[model samples]
Target: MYDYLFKLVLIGDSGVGKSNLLSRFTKNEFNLEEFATKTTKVEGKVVKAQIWDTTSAYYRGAVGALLIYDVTRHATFENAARWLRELRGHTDPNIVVMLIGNKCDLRHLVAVKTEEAKAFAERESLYFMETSALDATNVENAFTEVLTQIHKIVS
Candidate 1:
């Protein structure tokens, strides 16, 4: 019901499925075999998100950000930590940031525990969640939840 311009950056390791998770949330699409590779940069673009998401990124032309990781991969979790550091260095202080543990559908393969992520989120005061881009599960909601929280902050 509202139109707002915002920049939302996706941050994580090279192979943490950041792109795939973004696709799922923005396009309502999912792909499983999409593998991450070494890439230095990606373009910033806008997609349809809830009003909360829109507002979160509205003022600064880029407000909301999702830091994604693969729960089944320890390396991805480590990358998430690095991404958080990188975010602090590059983003606005008020940017609405969330830590997402992707590939939650792969429960048996999970290498990261919810408690660990919870601890990190609590320590950083960040919103955190697990998602499965392959199943289109929790991807959109994860973003929306964080955005809603941001809306509460700014409204």
Candidate 2:
């Protein structure tokens, strides 16, 4: 049992690896090239994450947000800022947010540059990480960091 339950929303365009990213993080499972339905809940020390792939694929009662983009498609990255702006408009200014560039497993096909995304995140004050659901790389840190930060703020 946890003392805090935080609603975390992951938002991005379709086919951005949003599902697989959570599958890997929450279930430790990944279907890199396929589909299926999936609440996104996994727990931390005192935090219980009520995660979702967004309704309207977006957020409302959210303590944290994950703006994911496929590293192999620059198209998703292009709209990441738009999502940030939209999310910003609705959520608390103090809400913790992270920008994840997913599909780092496809390193050879990377369409989004790490430097650019990191710089954008720094400018926007959103936490940033590149994740590979296929390999489970940084999948843990991405969500955990968000949870930890929220805890830090609330504690």
For each candidate, how many residue pairs have backbone atoms clashing (under 3 Å)?
4, 0
Whole-structure CA lDDT of model 2: 0.80
In lDDT terms, which candidate is top?
A: 2
* TM-scores for the candidates: 0.77, 0.87
Worst 10 residues of 1 by lDDT: 35-44
Clashing pairs in 1: 6-57, 7-61, 7-62, 57-63
Candidate 2 runs further than 4 Å off? 33-45, 55-58
lDDT of 1 by residue, 34-135 (tens): 212121111222233422221123333446778788898898887777767767766578778888888898889989999999998889888888888888
Q: lDDT (0-100) at residue 121 of candidate 1?
A: 86
RMSD of each: 8.3, 3.6
Stretch of 10 with least lDDT, candidate 2: 34-43
**Which stretches of candidate 1 lie above 4 Å from their native place?**
34-61
